[PDB]
Write a protein that binds this ligand. Structure first.
Ligand SMILES: N#Cc1cccc(-n2cc(-c3ccc(S(N)(=O)=O)s3)nn2)c1
Ligand SMILES: [Zn+2]
Length: 257
């Protein structure tokens, strides 16, 4: 089906998902000199104190840590958003080498990986409805660079060997996503899309300026994951990122100067 290889990767997605060539696709390069500071932007509110994680899943494209979103336990508000967006899952995109991996780029710089905290607009009632709306999702994007270890990531790294292959899951309760955030919440924002099929144009992207540092040992363990199912030939889960797409008729706004 779709994936990230030569024969089914991003340059092929458009044949099944014509919106791949649409007017508001993600990711994009963030040109920091042309992004405009917007005083209209209220401060971001990340309220993850009551977050309830449940499970971690290898879905054959990435791994997802899933949250209980049956009530407003972990939400994103403020910044460019109106209303309340509920955390449903986070996941990452990463490279085969430390010079690549992120989806968004900053003045053409690629980071080693990129974290996506995925939230849906509660006025649409459920995720599947929210994705059919231009303001249905808000994804908080955070770059990772390789340096010192991120203590708050290590519980995730340590469960990966239990979900090596596609379709494997493990219990993942009592995980605190506040441990993945950098100190600053300064951000860029723009309207865009899911960066995987079905590439729906339903996302308010909020990308943090400050990356988090992770260790080489941490990132290496992401790279031991498998795209394949158990008992199939091993294909390492690496380079599961989509490259930057045309900005078209969009302006990236900055919360800071
Ligand atoms: N409920 C539900 C449900 C069922 C199937 C899939 C999903 N679901 C899909 C996604 C996403 C696909 C791409 C992204 S991305 N890389 O953040 O733009 S998030 N996030 N949750 C959610
Ligand atoms: Zn993603």
């Amino acid at each position: 089906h779709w994936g990230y290889g030569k024969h089914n990767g991003p340059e092929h997605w458009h044949k099944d998902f014509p919106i791949a060539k649409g007017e508001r696709q993600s990711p994009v390069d963030i040109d920091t000199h042309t992004a405009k500071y917007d005083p209209s932007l209220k401060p971001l509110s990340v309220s993850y104190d009551q977050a309830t994680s449940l499970r971690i899943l290898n879905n054959g494209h990435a791994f997802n840590v899933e949250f209980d979103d049956s009530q407003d336990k972990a939400v994103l508000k403020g910044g460019p958003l109106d209303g309340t967006y509920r955390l449903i899952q986070f996941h990452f995109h990463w490279g085969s080498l430390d010079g690549q991996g992120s989806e968004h780029t900053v003045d053409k710089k690629k980071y080693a990986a990129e974290l996506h905290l995925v939230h849906w607009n509660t006025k649409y009632g459920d995720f599947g409805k929210a994705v059919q709306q231009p303001d249905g999702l808000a994804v908080l994007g955070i770059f990772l660079k390789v340096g010192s270890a991120k203590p708050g990531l290590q519980k995730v790294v340590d469960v990966l060997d239990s979900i090596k292959t596609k379709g494997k899951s493990a219990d993942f309760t009592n995980f605190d996503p506040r441990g993945l955030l950098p100190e600053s919440l300064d951000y860029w924002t723009y309207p865009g899309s899911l960066t995987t099929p079905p590439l729906l144009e339903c996302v308010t992207w909020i990308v943090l300026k400050e990356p988090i540092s992770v260790s080489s040992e941490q990132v290496l363990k992401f790279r031991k994951l498998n795209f394949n199912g158990e008992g199939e030939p091993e294909e390492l889960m690496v380079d599961n990122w989509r490259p930057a797409q045309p900005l078209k008729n969009r302006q990236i706004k900055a919360s800071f100067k």
